Design a protein around this ligand. Structure first.
Ligand SMILES: [Mg+2]
Ligand SMILES: [Mg+2]
Ligand SMILES: [Mg+2]
Ligand SMILES: [Mg+2]
Ligand SMILES: [Mg+2]
Ligand SMILES: [Mg+2]
Ligand SMILES: [Mg+2]
Ligand SMILES: [Mg+2]
Ligand SMILES: [Mg+2]
Ligand SMILES: [Mg+2]
Ligand SMILES: [Mg+2]
Ligand SMILES: [Mg+2]
Ligand SMILES: [Mg+2]
Ligand SMILES: [Mg+2]
Ligand SMILES: [Mg+2]
Ligand SMILES: [Mg+2]
Ligand SMILES: [Mg+2]
Ligand SMILES: [Mg+2]
Ligand SMILES: [Mg+2]
Ligand SMILES: [Mg+2]
Ligand SMILES: [Mg+2]
Ligand SMILES: [Mg+2]
Ligand SMILES: [Mg+2]
Ligand SMILES: [Mg+2]
Ligand SMILES: [Mg+2]
Ligand SMILES: [Mg+2]
Ligand SMILES: [Mg+2]
Ligand SMILES: [Mg+2]
Ligand SMILES: [Mg+2]
Ligand SMILES: [Mg+2]
Ligand SMILES: [Mg+2]
Ligand SMILES: [Mg+2]
Ligand SMILES: [Mg+2]
Ligand SMILES: [Mg+2]
Ligand SMILES: [Mg+2]
Ligand SMILES: [Mg+2]
Ligand SMILES: [Mg+2]
Ligand SMILES: [Mg+2]
Ligand SMILES: [Mg+2]
Ligand SMILES: [Mg+2]
Ligand SMILES: [Mg+2]
Ligand SMILES: [Mg+2]
Ligand SMILES: [Mg+2]
Ligand SMILES: [Mg+2]
Ligand SMILES: [Mg+2]
Ligand SMILES: [Mg+2]
Ligand SMILES: [Mg+2]
Ligand SMILES: [Mg+2]
Ligand SMILES: [Mg+2]
Ligand SMILES: [Mg+2]
Ligand SMILES: [Mg+2]
Ligand SMILES: [Mg+2]
Ligand SMILES: [Mg+2]
Ligand SMILES: [Mg+2]
Ligand SMILES: [Mg+2]
Ligand code: NA
Lengths: 184, 46
RNA sequence: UAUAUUAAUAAUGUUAUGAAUAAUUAUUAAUAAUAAUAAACUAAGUGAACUGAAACAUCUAAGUAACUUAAGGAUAAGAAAUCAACAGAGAUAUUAUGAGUAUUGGUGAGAGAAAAUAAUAAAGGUCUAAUAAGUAUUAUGUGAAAAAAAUGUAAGAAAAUAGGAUAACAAAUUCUAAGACUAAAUACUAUUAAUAAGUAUAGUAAGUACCGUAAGGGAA
RNA sequence: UGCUGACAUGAGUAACGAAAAAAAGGUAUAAACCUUUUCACCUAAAACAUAAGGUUUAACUAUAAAAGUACGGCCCCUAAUUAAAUUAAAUAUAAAUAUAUUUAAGAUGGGAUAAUCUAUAUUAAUAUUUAUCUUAAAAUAUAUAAUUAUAUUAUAUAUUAUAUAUUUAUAUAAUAUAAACUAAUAAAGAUCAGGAAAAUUAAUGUAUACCGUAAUGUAGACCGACUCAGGUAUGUAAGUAGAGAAUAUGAAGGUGAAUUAGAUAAUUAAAGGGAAGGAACUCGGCAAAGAUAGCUCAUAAGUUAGUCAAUAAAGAGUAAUAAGAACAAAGUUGUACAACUGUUUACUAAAAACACCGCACUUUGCAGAAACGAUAAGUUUAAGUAUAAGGUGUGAACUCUGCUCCAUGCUUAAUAUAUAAAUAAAAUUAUUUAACGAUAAUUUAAUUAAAUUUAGGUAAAUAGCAGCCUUAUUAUGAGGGUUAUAAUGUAGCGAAAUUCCUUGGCCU
RNA sequence: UAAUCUUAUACUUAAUUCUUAAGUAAUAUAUAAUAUAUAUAUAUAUUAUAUAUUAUAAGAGA
RNA sequence: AUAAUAGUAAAGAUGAAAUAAUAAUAAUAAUUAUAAGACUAAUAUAUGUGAAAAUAUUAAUUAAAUAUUAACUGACAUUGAG
């Protein structure tokens, strides 16, 4: 977020090097914004981004503009650390997984308004044709005289319900989630 | 918009699509060639 | 780059100190290469629909068309864990009778054996296996319109004192699975010969002309 | 409405495909061929160069001439993409095949040297898009070093005169139009943030391969069945004029044609003019007519503040007063619908339909959601990570968006609650057996799902928003009492693109 | 958790390379003995015996 | 608000009652442990301070502030539409 040219950032993903070791006391020095480190080092409560899953793999979660996660708890017994992601889903992440300190840049990205259709086209976004505009053969919402919704439940062109229908369900669900994201 | 001129020649494209070697290279094209040979065709491909 | 290397010699000219280093020609020895291959017939895999049932959904069309794969001059099958019925036969293939009979079917449409007796047929019997286990059998899901032998999932035997065969059981009978080979009659193509109440619009050109981007269609 | 062939009929009818021709002569053979002269047409083309294409049509068989420099291919290199190719076991798969990775191919692109003319081999060794302003500098004139006004301002070459290497080289100075245009340079604005891939010295080389080259190419030589007013890529495109590639003309070049000659009724087409009237036409001003500068000024209400409205309407200056080329320029307003620029039925609909930017809902934590995959591996999503991506509705913004979960769904919680397959062992029964046994069914015992039900939640999910009675002198109905329901139409709007009765009543 | 699954990344003999076998050197693990330090247990060093040269790391996990 | 601990059937509310993200999925009360905002008990009298709105947890910075003397200026003041 507040990073500007001239700032200095380290990374303690390998570990605390012999420079800083020779010269908590270390935690406050380390937990400056912009520098990366394992969630074990990152104190409980503080805001982070580019949160990893595994102790070896890269930062996956919380990458987009003005997004962030928050460290909620850490369990050295199970080698996990409960982290709240941007969605609000509380989630187990490996205790030795990587995460940068601070919120992501460009918080005001969301407030941008594209002026015109052409801007969307430039960005690489072709037009969405509504299901109600289509013929019945093309989309369930299609058909009807005048403009009608056909008494048809809001759903995709391939019949998957659009409003509220949980798509990841049953056995195939997320094992690592502690508390599901706030919904509606 | 007047129709009729759907053929728009370009030798290179023709040879890529309908040339002998294109037929030979594909399995389906090889089968076509064989079928034409069986029929008795003088001209198997472009 | 095979009118090639690589090496060994021989002849030629140059470099540096009789010996050494590169190039060109000519012999000798060494090193790799050329898929244009049928089609029909056979076997295997996957497998429609129109259609019929005066509708249609089981059923039918049909294991057909088609696509796919693989083999041989043919392939397949073949010397009974076969049939039969207390008498007997005694390999497989094709045809005639048996017989449109038994059998079976939304018991509709319709489908339909075998034994036995005849031909055709070739010498038609003969070991190649240390005699066969995740096999027979069972449950279950499928499976040639009758008649099974197959098969995914999983339980799973027996030694000839045994095992297979029929709703079931008892008697009897018959055969020996889980190892094998096999001409001949047959299919298709080509050739030769002979016979045509066949063809000159089924009588030789041309898969050409021409049509189509193309698969493909196709004259006189 | 049989098939094939032949021949009729309409009929010597229509038509002969945008078109400017004339004479003389080749030739006592020419409307059509060739030549000469005249006339016309195209001229940012009907010209000249080319690309693609094609029955070589060409100025032709005695036929389209390349080592390379404002020459192309071939070649080297790669993009998009392609590949019976590539890796006891790359992965997946009824077969076919498919996937991932390698390698190979693949131009529409990149590729050293050159008029001083230039040398490509072998061996060895370590670059989206647009812009060039302002300032500043010096130069030229007016006025009294400094002000005012005007052009000029990075590069492109010949001449002359100097200073150094020695008439050939290097540097310096001075001389020298305007308007376009090119390339190469420099600095730099905007978000939409801008390909890929293939070293250098030295020595030794270099006898320079193949293919393209005609003509046609806004067309009679290609794609349209035709010598078809259609379709067809690029570069030059004389001057005069102009803001210009508009428009007029046309230097040069090319062309004047498989139909001609006459006549020009009715009638049709495509044009020109029109008294008096001026929409009386008609479904409807359809069609036609209508431009008192195009430059410089000036330009309102409204408004989302955007000269949006505007190119405002009117109007002014310059020009012209009787007029006297073409081309650009064709009013003002009210309402309905849609924010807008866009898109759409190639060949009857361009719209009020689609899209849109914005708004809202929702799904998915990434070994995700979505889609594709006889079905997989896997691929897109994404080299992204919830301010992201997919799905759904609505459709910029202002003022706003009421009440309702009954139903269909979704969503959360309850052993509330049934039933499917799957199992031990053991009881009668039935069949059989002389007997045990064997074979069938049937019934018992612990451990049961999702579903369903119930109760919430969810309407910018799918959806819904009743009727009767009668009370303030008559009327109206603020009120009052009922039934029904999940709730009972709120704000607004209203004979609406929604109103049948209906040409509703009233006003303009 | 060696069920499953996901992700990432030397010499010598015998039949120039290729493979077998023997012993030796090198590393790792398991077992036994000896010595030393701390609170019957843990750590370090040395010696003997046995095994290995798809792996390691991370994650999910009956 | 979340989590843990142990613990038992009610809890919370009100005039009295119910509805609810209350409670036999184990709460409330209790004890711990994290986080989050927003407020400032006594002193307090708004005493005082500020032009008025205002203004009382602590600290620092910068600004402005009282009285009396000494010296200086010499009416430079008051009020104040717009
Ligand atoms: Mg849309
Ligand atoms: Mg439609
Ligand atoms: Mg549908
Ligand atoms: Mg409607
Ligand atoms: Mg055609
Ligand atoms: Mg078959
Ligand atoms: Mg029928
Ligand atoms: Mg019917
Ligand atoms: Mg059948
Ligand atoms: Mg055989
Ligand atoms: Mg049959
Ligand atoms: Mg046997
Ligand atoms: Mg046996
Ligand atoms: Mg069975
Ligand atoms: Mg046998
Ligand atoms: Mg055999
Ligand atoms: Mg007839
Ligand atoms: Mg006539
Ligand atoms: Mg006539
Ligand atoms: Mg005529
Ligand atoms: Mg003449
Ligand atoms: Mg013009
Ligand atoms: Mg290549
Ligand atoms: Mg090219
Ligand atoms: Mg040419
Ligand atoms: Mg030429
Ligand atoms: Mg030309
Ligand atoms: Mg033409
Ligand atoms: Mg043509
Ligand atoms: Mg035509
Ligand atoms: Mg001109
Ligand atoms: Mg001229
Ligand atoms: Mg011409
Ligand atoms: Mg003509
Ligand atoms: Mg008139
Ligand atoms: Mg008049
Ligand atoms: Mg009238
Ligand atoms: Mg009228
Ligand atoms: Mg008009
Ligand atoms: Mg105004
Ligand atoms: Mg005009
Ligand atoms: Mg519009
Ligand atoms: Mg149309
Ligand atoms: Mg139209
Ligand atoms: Mg549309
Ligand atoms: Mg959008
Ligand atoms: Mg809106
Ligand atoms: Mg999916
Ligand atoms: Mg979205
Ligand atoms: Mg809409
Ligand atoms: Mg059951
Ligand atoms: Mg209405
Ligand atoms: Mg006061
Ligand atoms: Mg206080
Ligand atoms: Mg005052
Ligand atoms: Na509809």
């Amino acid at each position: 977020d507040g990073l500007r040219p001239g700032d200095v950032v380290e990374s303690f993903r390998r570990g605390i090097p012999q420079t800083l070791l020779n010269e908590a006391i270390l935690s406050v020095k380390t937990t400056q914004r912009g520098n990366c480190l394992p969630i074990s080092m990152i104190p409980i409560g503080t805001i982070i981004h580019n949160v990893g899953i595994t102790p070896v793999g890269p930062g996956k979660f919380c990458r987009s503009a003005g997004t962030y996660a928050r460290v909620l708890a850490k369990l050295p017994e199970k080698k996990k650390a409960i982290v709240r992601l941007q969605s609000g889903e509380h989630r187990y992440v490996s205790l030795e997984a990587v995460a940068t300190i601070g919120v992501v840049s460009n918080i005001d990205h969301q407030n941008r308004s594209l002026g015109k259709a052409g801007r969307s086209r430039w960005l690489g976004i072709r037009p969405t044709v509504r299901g109600v505009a289509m013929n019945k053969c093309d989309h369930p919402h299609g058909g009807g005289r005048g403009k009608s919704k056909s008494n048809k439940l809001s759903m995709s062109p391939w019949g998957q319900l659009a409003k509220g229908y949980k798509t990841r369900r049953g056995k195939n669900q997320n094992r690592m989630k502690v508390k599901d994201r706030p919904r509606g | 918009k007047s129709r009729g001129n759907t053929y728009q020649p370009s030798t290179l494209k023709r040879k890529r699509t309908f040339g002998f070697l294109a037929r030979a290279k594909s399995k389906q094209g090889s089968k076509i060639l064989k079928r034409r040979k069986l029929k008795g065709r003088w001209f198997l491909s472009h």
